[PDB]
């Protein structure tokens, strides 16, 4: 049951910089986390002010 599995792909949904199975992602995580946490922090600044 499990060996006959191909995981369907989300090519339309990913970021256009991590669309490479060659490319490693030790470092590119911090840009994405900085973007999202930037949004959360700026929202928190607006809320607390």
């Amino acid at each position: 049951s499990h060996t006959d599995i191909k995981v369907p792909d989300f090519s339309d949904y990913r970021r256009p910089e991590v669309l490479d199975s060659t490319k490693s992602s030790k470092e590119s995580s911090e840009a994405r986390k900085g973007f999202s946490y930037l949004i959360t922090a700026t929202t928190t600044v607006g809320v607390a002010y």
Binding site: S28, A31, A41, V45, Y49
Partner: protein, 55 residues
């Protein structure tokens, strides 16, 4: 460049909260001056600071 800012001021949540409070008072300063400049620009003339300066 975003990853460098994540490396600096987004990891330890205590310093995270403290630095967004610092940015919040930064935003207080900039936002009050922005609102004052814009509202005086759309009401150049008919505001009491003008007439009081002429008094």
């Amino acid at each position: 460049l975003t990853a460098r800012l994540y490396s600096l001021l987004f990891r330890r949540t205590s310093t995270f909260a403290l630095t967004i409070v610092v940015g919040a008072l930064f935003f207080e300063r900039a936002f009050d001056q922005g609102a004052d400049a814009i509202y005086e620009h759309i009401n150049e003339g008919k505001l009491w600071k003008h007439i009081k300066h002429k008094y």
